[PDB]
Amino acid sequence: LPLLMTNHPAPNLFGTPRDKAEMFRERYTILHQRTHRHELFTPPVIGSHPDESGSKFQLKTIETLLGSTTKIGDAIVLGMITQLKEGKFFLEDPTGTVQLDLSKA
Amino acid sequence: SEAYFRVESGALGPEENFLSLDDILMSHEKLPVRTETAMPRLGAFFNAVPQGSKLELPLWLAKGLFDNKRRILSVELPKIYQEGWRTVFSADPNVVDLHKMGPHFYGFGSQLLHFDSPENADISQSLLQTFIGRFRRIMDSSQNAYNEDTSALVARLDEMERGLFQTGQKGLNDFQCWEKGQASQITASNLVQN
Amino acid sequence: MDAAEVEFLAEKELVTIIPNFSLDKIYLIGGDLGPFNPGLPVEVPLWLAINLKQRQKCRLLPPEWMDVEKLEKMRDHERKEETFTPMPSPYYMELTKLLLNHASDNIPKADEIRTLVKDMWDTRIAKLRVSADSFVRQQEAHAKLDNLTLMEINTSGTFLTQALNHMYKLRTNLQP
Amino acid sequence: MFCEKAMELIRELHRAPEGQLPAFNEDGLRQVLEEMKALYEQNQSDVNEAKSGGRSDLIPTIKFRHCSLLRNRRCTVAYLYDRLLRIRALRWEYGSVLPNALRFHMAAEEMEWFNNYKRSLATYMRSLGGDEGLDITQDMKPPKSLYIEVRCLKDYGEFEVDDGTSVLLKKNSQHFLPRWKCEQLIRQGVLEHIL
Amino acid sequence: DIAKIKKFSKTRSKDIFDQLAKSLAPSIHGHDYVKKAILCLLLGGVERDLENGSHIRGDINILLIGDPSVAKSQLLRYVLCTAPRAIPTTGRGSSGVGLTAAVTTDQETGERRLEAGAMVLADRGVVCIDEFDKMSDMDRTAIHEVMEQGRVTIAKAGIHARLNARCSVLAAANPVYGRYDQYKTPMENIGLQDSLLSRFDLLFIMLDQMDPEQDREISDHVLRMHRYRAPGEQDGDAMPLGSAVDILATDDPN
Ligand SMILES: Nc1ncnc2c1ncn2[C@@H]1O[C@H](COP(=O)(O)OP(=O)(O)NP(=O)(O)O)[C@@H](O)[C@H]1O
Ligand SMILES: [Mg+2]
């Protein structure tokens, strides 16, 4: 939507505290809507007789796996790399954050 | 004048109107059936659905699958069109809640005759007598409920009867606006909201 | 059809006015009118009569039937009969509204005239209600409504015709 | 059941009886078309399997998916057609140039259809007489008076009455003008007819 | 208020007790053993009469003790809806008189007679007691005889009688201090006297353990239930307040 059709304010140099977060939130938003339109999307209604995990590329956010999914061997998450502590890298998305053990890349 | 008018409902006719939103929503309502032969690959929905299975599926789909030889499935009436509820309607049509008993009561009942049930005549007579019984209350309420909350009056009416109620209310409001002279003013359309 | 359109047809009815201006005969497409001589009665369509009265160019005279005695007789006859009786004008309600709202000063005893016309309207709309109910209850195929006026038919006819369409399709859905 | 996404298009339009136009449900249209594509691919696989292999029990589910496809087609076509009906009413109820807040709700192809309809309507109106045609979009109500008093609701530009004569439509200014000249602006809400 | 299809279903189903217990209160997730115990309460044992004239009580009494918001009250409400002749009761809103019997004047004559209380109305049925830890001791004196012997003894007005009160008790209570304390013995979490506790067949302690997986499944079920809408209801309806909707002396969809 163009901004005139929305509640979004006009851009200016002396931005609000919200706008600093809005940068990275919108970068995630564009990449997220880009990602979910790829072939990784879930099959259609009985597209395959056995169910399939999004062409083996089914997606999730950080807040979903902060829960019952311990040692689930097929998690895939879109998120920003951050060295949130020195050497102890973290991933972040608009839902939350989690540590990255990147011993194998 | 050239105001928007929805494609009229053809549910009461031999076949429903193709482009009618009301007919589409009416035919979406589910209908109990018994499957006459096993159907492969549909076990994901109700791998084969076995023979003799009881199912509830949309009326459009029942009509599509139904051939008069009864080869794929047998179609059974909903409870509101069987003899007990027909007797309930015969008691006093004014008190039954046709809004809760399927909002398209008459349209669904008319299309239910397509399956050639042995009690088609009873269903048709019940629909006709229900409409005859409810007509006078619909007429009086629509034509005399001026400028007030019509919720309680319109609550127990099915969508066809609601359309009749709105027609009567529109006639009443038109005549009252005429009698009080408000009909003479030229005014902006409803699109001035934008 | 809207009540304003029924009024538009009612405005074609002829009424008598007394001009306060001089004008020779004017040749309108629907029929020539005049000459308009000051102080003398002349017969014109009701729209022109109302327009000239609004512009202070004439005095309207009531129709011969806008008389309290005649209207009382018509009202009592209507209440006494069961069928719709012949009305003094085919657009009597609209004539009453226009003439009394615009020229109550000219028309004497306009309160009595308005009340009697309202009595006749109430009686005849009650008769039309009874006719509609009898139609639907007895499942009649047609009705006879000889003396109804266009406004009376227009007030309730859309609802009645839609209801009878639904009734016809309900009673004919076993055609094979 | 398959059809529910198509029913959301239908329920969207049925939930607005007043005739106003909702935003075009492009995503829903894409989803029902994708569903139809998947259904057709499955149906083709199954039907050629049945016919080539001589396997007869597939025919009920073939008819199932065929009827489901026809249902999807009926729903989306009814949605588009009812949207066309709502759009067609705008030319008469408001005018030719729709406001941008409403034009933002229409698809590009809907604007194409609307422009074609406007050109066809103007061609028909021109062809009704020897010169200048007949503007049947005017005279929507029966005429009561030759002149009317109108009040400006919107602060607005110069409005020509006849040739060198014109009136400034500043807000709260009040003019006495011909009805046939003021009808369009009243219907658009620029002017308020009083008395 | 036919049996042949039931006697066929018990053969078609495998361990139908488990299926019934799982299907007992669909809106409430988990608490499988409690649901099995409630089903046992609903069905009951068989009351023995011994050759010596003594009788063995056949009803089963269940006491649910647990934290806030662990569906105890909801299980009581389901039992009230599902069972024939199940009487509701709550600890602060009842008295020993109202539980058993009250002397009241019959205005047809003016003479006074016994009018049955909750546990007498519940005879050969169930009585559901919520907030049971909030009852007064003098009020629980009435419950003791009902649970122990299946009767209540009354001596009031002109009448001296042993009223039949043969009912299963399904009581719900919170532990002392509101929330169950792990650092205290069960006999101190449970504020009730051991004499009273001996009368219950089964006593269940159920706790709001905040496990993340259990919370995941519970919250999923709760939000699914809150998302549900009935088929005979429009997409944005608020449910109507109560009004009469029965229009034949016998049920129609049969
Ligand atoms: N396992 C569960 N499944 C579904 N809803 C639950 C569950 N546990 C609690 N709830 C909901 O929590 C709310 C409170 O239930 P309630 O029966 O009053 O809990 P309780 O154990 O009786 N606690 P309390 O009344 O304070 O002693 C209800 O809306 C229940 O539906
Ligand atoms: Mg509770």
PDB file of N, CA and C and ligand atoms in Angstrom, chain E residues 27-31 66-75 130-131 172-174 218 221-222 226, ligand 1:
ATOM      1  N   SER E  27     -14.381 -30.795  26.191  1.00  0.00           N
ATOM      2  CA  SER E  27     -13.850 -29.446  26.317  1.00  0.00           C
ATOM      3  C   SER E  27     -12.655 -29.366  27.263  1.00  0.00           C
ATOM      4  N   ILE E  28     -12.457 -30.361  28.129  1.00  0.00           N
ATOM      5  CA  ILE E  28     -11.392 -30.360  29.129  1.00  0.00           C
ATOM      6  C   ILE E  28     -10.310 -31.330  28.666  1.00  0.00           C
ATOM      7  N   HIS E  29      -9.092 -30.812  28.524  1.00  0.00           N
ATOM      8  CA  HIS E  29      -7.940 -31.584  28.089  1.00  0.00           C
ATOM      9  C   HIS E  29      -7.263 -32.264  29.272  1.00  0.00           C
ATOM     10  N   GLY E  30      -6.746 -33.466  29.032  1.00  0.00           N
ATOM     11  CA  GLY E  30      -6.005 -34.178  30.053  1.00  0.00           C
ATOM     12  C   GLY E  30      -6.895 -34.716  31.162  1.00  0.00           C
ATOM     13  N   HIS E  31      -6.269 -34.952  32.319  1.00  0.00           N
ATOM     14  CA  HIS E  31      -6.943 -35.491  33.507  1.00  0.00           C
ATOM     15  C   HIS E  31      -7.618 -36.832  33.207  1.00  0.00           C
ATOM     16  N   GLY E  66      -7.181 -29.392  44.372  1.00  0.00           N
ATOM     17  CA  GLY E  66      -6.195 -28.856  43.454  1.00  0.00           C
ATOM     18  C   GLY E  66      -6.181 -27.347  43.399  1.00  0.00           C
ATOM     19  N   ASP E  67      -5.199 -26.856  42.656  1.00  0.00           N
ATOM     20  CA  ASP E  67      -4.882 -25.447  42.474  1.00  0.00           C
ATOM     21  C   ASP E  67      -6.016 -24.664  41.819  1.00  0.00           C
ATOM     22  N   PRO E  68      -5.926 -23.333  41.775  1.00  0.00           N
ATOM     23  CA  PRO E  68      -6.852 -22.565  40.938  1.00  0.00           C
ATOM     24  C   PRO E  68      -6.673 -22.910  39.465  1.00  0.00           C
ATOM     25  N   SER E  69      -7.768 -22.777  38.722  1.00  0.00           N
ATOM     26  CA  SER E  69      -7.813 -22.963  37.272  1.00  0.00           C
ATOM     27  C   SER E  69      -7.245 -24.307  36.787  1.00  0.00           C
ATOM     28  N   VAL E  70      -7.693 -25.422  37.387  1.00  0.00           N
ATOM     29  CA  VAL E  70      -7.362 -26.759  36.866  1.00  0.00           C
ATOM     30  C   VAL E  70      -8.631 -27.577  36.598  1.00  0.00           C
ATOM     31  N   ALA E  71      -9.702 -26.900  36.174  1.00  0.00           N
ATOM     32  CA  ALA E  71     -10.929 -27.482  35.620  1.00  0.00           C
ATOM     33  C   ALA E  71     -11.746 -28.332  36.605  1.00  0.00           C
ATOM     34  N   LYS E  72     -11.533 -28.218  37.923  1.00  0.00           N
ATOM     35  CA  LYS E  72     -12.354 -28.986  38.870  1.00  0.00           C
ATOM     36  C   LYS E  72     -13.830 -28.600  38.770  1.00  0.00           C
ATOM     37  N   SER E  73     -14.122 -27.293  38.830  1.00  0.00           N
ATOM     38  CA  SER E  73     -15.507 -26.835  38.716  1.00  0.00           C
ATOM     39  C   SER E  73     -16.113 -27.251  37.384  1.00  0.00           C
ATOM     40  N   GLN E  74     -15.315 -27.223  36.314  1.00  0.00           N
ATOM     41  CA  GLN E  74     -15.843 -27.605  35.009  1.00  0.00           C
ATOM     42  C   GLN E  74     -16.181 -29.090  34.951  1.00  0.00           C
ATOM     43  N   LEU E  75     -15.383 -29.941  35.604  1.00  0.00           N
ATOM     44  CA  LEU E  75     -15.737 -31.359  35.661  1.00  0.00           C
ATOM     45  C   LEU E  75     -17.041 -31.563  36.423  1.00  0.00           C
ATOM     46  N   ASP E 130     -19.046 -28.017  45.037  1.00  0.00           N
ATOM     47  CA  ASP E 130     -17.891 -27.178  44.742  1.00  0.00           C
ATOM     48  C   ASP E 130     -17.540 -26.349  45.975  1.00  0.00           C
ATOM     49  N   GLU E 131     -16.282 -25.905  46.038  1.00  0.00           N
ATOM     50  CA  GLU E 131     -15.765 -25.147  47.190  1.00  0.00           C
ATOM     51  C   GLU E 131     -16.017 -25.894  48.502  1.00  0.00           C
ATOM     52  N   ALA E 172     -15.345 -30.995  45.166  1.00  0.00           N
ATOM     53  CA  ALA E 172     -14.180 -30.267  44.680  1.00  0.00           C
ATOM     54  C   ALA E 172     -13.771 -29.244  45.729  1.00  0.00           C
ATOM     55  N   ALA E 173     -12.466 -29.144  45.971  1.00  0.00           N
ATOM     56  CA  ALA E 173     -11.937 -28.281  47.017  1.00  0.00           C
ATOM     57  C   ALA E 173     -10.589 -27.736  46.580  1.00  0.00           C
ATOM     58  N   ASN E 174     -10.210 -26.557  47.139  1.00  0.00           N
ATOM     59  CA  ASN E 174      -8.832 -26.102  47.002  1.00  0.00           C
ATOM     60  C   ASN E 174      -8.041 -26.531  48.237  1.00  0.00           C
ATOM     61  N   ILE E 218      -2.447 -27.854  26.343  1.00  0.00           N
ATOM     62  CA  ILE E 218      -3.607 -27.294  27.039  1.00  0.00           C
ATOM     63  C   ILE E 218      -4.061 -26.002  26.369  1.00  0.00           C
ATOM     64  N   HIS E 221      -5.727 -26.634  23.021  1.00  0.00           N
ATOM     65  CA  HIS E 221      -7.099 -27.107  23.186  1.00  0.00           C
ATOM     66  C   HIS E 221      -8.030 -25.976  23.612  1.00  0.00           C
ATOM     67  N   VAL E 222      -7.582 -25.141  24.554  1.00  0.00           N
ATOM     68  CA  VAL E 222      -8.419 -24.053  25.062  1.00  0.00           C
ATOM     69  C   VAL E 222      -8.744 -23.065  23.948  1.00  0.00           C
ATOM     70  N   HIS E 226     -12.330 -22.046  22.315  1.00  0.00           N
ATOM     71  CA  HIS E 226     -12.810 -20.670  22.231  1.00  0.00           C
ATOM     72  C   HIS E 226     -13.030 -20.228  20.786  1.00  0.00           C
TER      73      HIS E 226
HETATM   74  N1  LIG F   1      -7.241 -28.792  31.190  1.00  0.00           N
HETATM   75  C1  LIG F   1      -8.071 -27.803  30.856  1.00  0.00           C
HETATM   76  N2  LIG F   1      -8.707 -27.863  29.667  1.00  0.00           N
HETATM   77  C2  LIG F   1      -9.566 -26.895  29.344  1.00  0.00           C
HETATM   78  N3  LIG F   1      -9.910 -25.814  30.049  1.00  0.00           N
HETATM   79  C3  LIG F   1      -9.265 -25.781  31.225  1.00  0.00           C
HETATM   80  C4  LIG F   1      -8.356 -26.711  31.695  1.00  0.00           C
HETATM   81  N4  LIG F   1      -7.890 -26.352  32.950  1.00  0.00           N
HETATM   82  C5  LIG F   1      -8.520 -25.231  33.207  1.00  0.00           C
HETATM   83  N5  LIG F   1      -9.352 -24.817  32.201  1.00  0.00           N
HETATM   84  C6  LIG F   1     -10.231 -23.653  32.207  1.00  0.00           C
HETATM   85  O1  LIG F   1      -9.960 -22.874  33.355  1.00  0.00           O
HETATM   86  C7  LIG F   1     -11.178 -22.216  33.790  1.00  0.00           C
HETATM   87  C8  LIG F   1     -11.389 -22.410  35.274  1.00  0.00           C
HETATM   88  O2  LIG F   1     -11.798 -23.778  35.500  1.00  0.00           O
HETATM   89  P1  LIG F   1     -12.259 -24.277  36.926  1.00  0.00           P
HETATM   90  O3  LIG F   1     -13.051 -25.519  36.802  1.00  0.00           O
HETATM   91  O4  LIG F   1     -12.953 -23.183  37.740  1.00  0.00           O
HETATM   92  O5  LIG F   1     -10.885 -24.574  37.606  1.00  0.00           O
HETATM   93  P2  LIG F   1     -10.840 -25.129  39.045  1.00  0.00           P
HETATM   94  O6  LIG F   1      -9.906 -26.359  39.092  1.00  0.00           O
HETATM   95  O7  LIG F   1     -12.188 -25.456  39.590  1.00  0.00           O
HETATM   96  N6  LIG F   1     -10.097 -23.959  39.926  1.00  0.00           N
HETATM   97  P3  LIG F   1     -10.911 -23.285  41.209  1.00  0.00           P
HETATM   98  O8  LIG F   1     -12.424 -23.091  40.836  1.00  0.00           O
HETATM   99  O9  LIG F   1     -10.258 -21.861  41.394  1.00  0.00           O
HETATM  100  O10 LIG F   1     -10.694 -24.162  42.385  1.00  0.00           O
HETATM  101  C9  LIG F   1     -12.308 -22.783  32.927  1.00  0.00           C
HETATM  102  O11 LIG F   1     -12.702 -21.887  31.894  1.00  0.00           O
HETATM  103  C10 LIG F   1     -11.695 -24.059  32.350  1.00  0.00           C
HETATM  104  O12 LIG F   1     -12.292 -24.388  31.104  1.00  0.00           O
END
